Each structure stands twice: as structure tokens, then as C-alpha cells.
Amino acid sequence: KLVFFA
């Protein structure tokens, strides 16, 4: 599972 927030 990847979660990226920028």
C-alpha cells in the first residue's frame, strides 16, 4: 500500500 500526499 502506497499513500502519498503533497
Sort residue 4 into left (φ over 0), alpha (ψ -120 to 50) or beta.
beta
Resolution rounded to one decimal, in angstroms: 1.9
Sort residue 5 into left (φ over 0), alpha (ψ -120 to 50) or beta.
beta
* R_g of the chain computed on alpha carbons: 6
C-alpha cell at 5: 500526499
C-alpha cell at 4: 502519498
> Could you tell me which residues come within 8 angstroms of residue 5 by beta carbon, excluding any fewer than 6 positions away?
none
